[PDB]
Amino acid sequence: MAAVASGSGEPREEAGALGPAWDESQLRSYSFPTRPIPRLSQSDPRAEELIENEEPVVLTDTNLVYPALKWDLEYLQENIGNGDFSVYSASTHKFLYYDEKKMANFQNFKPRSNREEMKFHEFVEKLQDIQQRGGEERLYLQQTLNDTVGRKIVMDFLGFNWNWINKQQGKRGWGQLTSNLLLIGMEGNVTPAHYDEQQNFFAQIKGYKRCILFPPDQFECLYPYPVHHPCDRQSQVDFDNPDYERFPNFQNVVGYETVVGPGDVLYIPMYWWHHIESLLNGGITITVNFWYKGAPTPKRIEYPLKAHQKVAIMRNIEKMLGEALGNPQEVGPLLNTMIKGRYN
Amino acid sequence: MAAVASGSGEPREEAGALGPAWDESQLRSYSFPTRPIPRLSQSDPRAEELIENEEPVVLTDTNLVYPALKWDLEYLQENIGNGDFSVYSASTHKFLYYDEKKMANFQNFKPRSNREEMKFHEFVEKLQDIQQRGGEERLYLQQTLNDTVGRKIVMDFLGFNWNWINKQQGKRGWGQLTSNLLLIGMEGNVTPAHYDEQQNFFAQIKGYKRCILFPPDQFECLYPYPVHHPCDRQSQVDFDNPDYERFPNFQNVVGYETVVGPGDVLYIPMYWWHHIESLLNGGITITVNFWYKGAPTPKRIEYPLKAHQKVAIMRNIEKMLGEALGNPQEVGPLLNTMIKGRYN
């Protein structure tokens, strides 16, 4: 009987009989099924095939950020330098991303998280203050690595496996590395489902993160915000309380998931939705991603179109209409007028 | 109490005490209100103002087609030449226009009228055959005037008031005259509501036609077919039996109407919807229209946009998506995906 959906599978055993890395109670509970993302060696031809076909895979032995595996708050505070770091703060576990430039278009959007620039030692101290007073405030540091980092971090950065990732960039025809985002979160933090328009090698350093991915063909089930809204590219669906009246096809969504730990690298293909959560009671998490611009669009389109190309078309229709109407608020009414009693 | 809608008004009296030109029983009955289109002399500055503002007006004294006022079936059969004339045939009074080039896109569209090419004497004879046998078949001749017409028709054509209409073309910045369509219909024939993308001076020659116009801002109430459908630019609504479940905003439509007779010229502005019916029991009708390409689009758009510019935008979105998806049938599903739970 057809009535597969293993999810992250049986938790892995840490070497030296150090016990399970995590347990099922540290995962949040959601309404949809999932199947596992494959975990493979970087020397496995299957892994090359998945990356080539823009499908996710966890690579267990790239050594991509090997020198960063010794990173923790004390080491970073000593060596990360005196630059500013963007720290998001929220009274909820969900850190929904928003584009500050688009907030003028939507005056009624009130962010639930707020950004504060601070030095790294201030970040560590605010964490301490929270932890000792039993506070419910949550922090998520998210900052691109820049030229202000200290000498030891430079040394560690130079020690990444550029041989391997530069070869991937070349083999896939991708554009330049645009940035490395340092992500330091508290246990239980969640980045809600969204897609990015760049290719991502997501390199886990400390702690464990559950990553739930959805292919671009589930656009219909995930209901992104309007393109001019500050939450462009993020799902409108509250995974903790899905509104099935507004979002009926969320009842059909099916994810791919994995739990990445220190040394793992997750390939998140461009336009793939991803929901990322730091495991409950797992301590702080540290990740560095590697964002690459996608390979150029082919000069002559080949049919059938891929799912992500249809997403690109819809985004461009929304952008063009916003510019032509002179106001993004008129996009919706025009689109509805175009469809009602004509295409629906 | 605000609870104006005169319609065509009290029928006009024919000169020489020849009685009313028409009576209310010769008009079909419809569900919506209407107000009158103004009837003015071409020397009235109000008429110039209406044409300039792309609003309809009936001009009563242009002499635009003065030499054609003696036209009837016998005169035309003698002098119109031996060319082919497109004659549409239908078992209904409604002659819904369709684009034969688009029929490959929609295999399930079965036209209710059929086109037959014939000589003018064959057209007259088929009319006779119908009239004598009490048949229910209906014919509508619709043919652009071309270089095959006989010498007397050339003389009559040369006698049109080109001084007047060439001045209008110049004053409005319109493009070239593209064609003169000769329209010869049977009493009771109806051309269902549609808009054209050219400017039209509609010159009535024989019989009376009731013209019901709707401004471009009633797009929302009139539900045009998809752009790739053969009935592009025609309303989907059956005015004789409006489906208010599919077309709810047809309950809000408001028209402008008039009855034109011999010597009248109706300005039908580009993008204005028009429904045209030859009066019941009024005999055959003869019209010649004058179609002009619109004035060029301004280089820099000025806001707010006019209603017809929003129509132009929607048409271009539908066209572009058809080309990009490689198949017009995919337009609807993509548009719905773009709107559902996002803009509606």
Binding site: I313, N316 | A324
Partner: peptide, 16 residues
């Protein structure tokens, strides 16, 4: 053009 509509941007969850 058909090519333009398929073109992608480079937007990511990162402040400029």
């Amino acid at each position: 053009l058909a090519d333009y509509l398929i073109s992608v941007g480079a937007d990511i969850n990162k402040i400029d």
